[PDB]
């Protein structure tokens, strides 16, 4: 007597002619579970920005003064719709390229390139505003310097910096836009100003734009910002007659690798894992998942289906 090795237990799989057949030893491949916290990745802890954007950390915000020195990291977490950003209204030219090239940098050492005590014929104190307050008092950024006249004068500026290291750099500067002529003749003295920046690959000249605008955050003026990368054995030059926001600190690239800039809102929790979706974490071995299409590390493939079971059975 011959026949089938009948059995029991209930589970259903999908076929091409029938839709809900019944099987015995089916096995599942889709994973639909996640712990729901931000975790570590092979030991190295992420960088968590609580209420602070990427531009507000690289320029230095008075209410973001805990990220002054930062250790190594794996990925960057940024909340949606931050609340600190740039206190003084304006813009940073080519922001998305900076948010694209920070995704391959894993460490930043900070270097003083022009000391704040090397301006004997200018003023670096009364350059504050009520838009960025520190503990209920006017203040400014902490990586740039705003230069105003002293003794009713503003001599021309010529400054150079020569790179004598084995790794690259990253320098930021800016320009100030006024709102009428009396303010310009008060903070600075010359009516017509310019800014010149030149290196072996860059050439740039700018002029201010005096006009009438509306109110944003209380003020009626704007400031712009730029950036570049200096290569070893090269120099950067400056020249200004007014409207200059001078650089004081710079960042040195010392490690490169793989990284990402997430957007999420979950809370931190001390654990360990080897994959990370922006709304949880994965610890499994099945080669498929369903949570989110952005990941980091090695993680199973992604699909949009709800069920995926291949049968190994009878009946």
């Amino acid at each position, epitope marked *: 007597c011959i026949g089938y090795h009948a059995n029991n237990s209930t589970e259903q799989v999908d076929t091409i002619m029938e839709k809900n057949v019944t099987v015995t030893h089916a096995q599942d491949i889709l994973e639909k579970t996640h712990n729901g916290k931000l975790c570590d990745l092979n030991g190295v802890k992420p960088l968590i920005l609580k209420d602070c954007s990427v531009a507000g950390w690289l320029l230095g915000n008075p209410m973001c003064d805990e990220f002054i020195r930062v250790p190594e990291w794996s990925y960057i977490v940024e909340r949606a719709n931050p609340a600190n950003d740039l206190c003084f209204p304006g813009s940073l030219n080519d922001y998305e390229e900076l948010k694209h090239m920070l995704s391959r940098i894993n460490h930043f050492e900070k270097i*003083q390139i022009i000391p*704040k*005590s*090397s301006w*004997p014929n200018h003023e670096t104190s009364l350059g504050v505003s009520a838009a960025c307050p520190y503990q209920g*008092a006017p203040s400014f950024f*902490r990586n740039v310097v705003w230069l105003i006249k002293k003794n009713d004068a503003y001599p021309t500026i010529k400054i150079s910096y020569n790179n004598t290291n084995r790794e690259d750099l990253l320098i930021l500067w800016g320009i100030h836009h006024s709102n009428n002529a009396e303010e310009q003749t008060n903070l600075y003295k010359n009516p017509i100003t310019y800014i010149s920046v030149g290196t072996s690959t860059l050439n740039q000249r700018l002029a201010p734009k005096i006009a009438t605008r509306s109110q944003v955050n209380g003020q009626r003026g704007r400031m712009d910002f730029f950036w570049t990368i200096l290569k070893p054995d090269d120099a950067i030059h400056f020249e200004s007659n007014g409207n200059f926001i001078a650089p004081e600190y710079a960042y040195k690239i010392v490690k490169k690798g793989d990284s990402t800039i997430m957007k999420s809102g979950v809370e931190y929790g001390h654990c360990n894992t080897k994959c990370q979706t922006p709304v949880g974490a994965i610890n499994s071995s099945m080669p498929f998942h369903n949570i989110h299409p952005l990941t980091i590390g090695e993680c199973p493939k992604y699909v949009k289906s709800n069920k995926l079971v291949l049968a190994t059975g009878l009946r």
Partner: antibody
Amino acid sequence: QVQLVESGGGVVQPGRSLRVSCAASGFIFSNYGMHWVRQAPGKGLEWVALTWYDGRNKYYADSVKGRFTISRDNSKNTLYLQMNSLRAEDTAVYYCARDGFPNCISATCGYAMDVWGQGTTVTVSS
Amino acid sequence: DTVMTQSPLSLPVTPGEPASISCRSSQSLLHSNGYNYLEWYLQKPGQSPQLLIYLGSIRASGVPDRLSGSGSGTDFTLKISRVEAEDVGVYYCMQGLETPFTFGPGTKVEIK
């Protein structure tokens, strides 16, 4: 104007502790670093401690390491120095001094000391 | 640690002619910016010190036009163009590159 006063000196026997103070009135106090300096009788000057503006990081010398402390305690415009394990060679005069430019966020900033105090004497005897 | 040597220990002068002092170190006090981290102070008898010079050659706010300083690497020098009776005290040399700040032996200027 700008001035600094100190008080708290006296006579102390070995093994005990002592507290010194330094009060300021003038410039805003929550935007500057502060220092302490000694001068033994007949000898030269020496350096002891340094604190930041907010108060996070602190630094001490090697003949002082792990034995004295420094704190700010803002909103009353004062500075403190707690001295434990007082030996015999620590007899000197003490001075306060602030930086010359605001908001130093590095260890060796490049700024110097501009305004100095007057001095208080501390002695170890008997 | 960095030792700081200063010579001469004593220096008698008379009004009218210039004078010079030196201060030496066992390490190169030159950063990558191109600036030297070295200072100069002064203490008149029975008083508190008073700062003279910032990083190398930048003067303070109050010092006359007679004091100047110039050097690089490991040798530094102060120069007084003309000497008066008020300029009598002790001059100290100080470094600021590494975290433990160190002074020097000092030097006296006695009229004669």
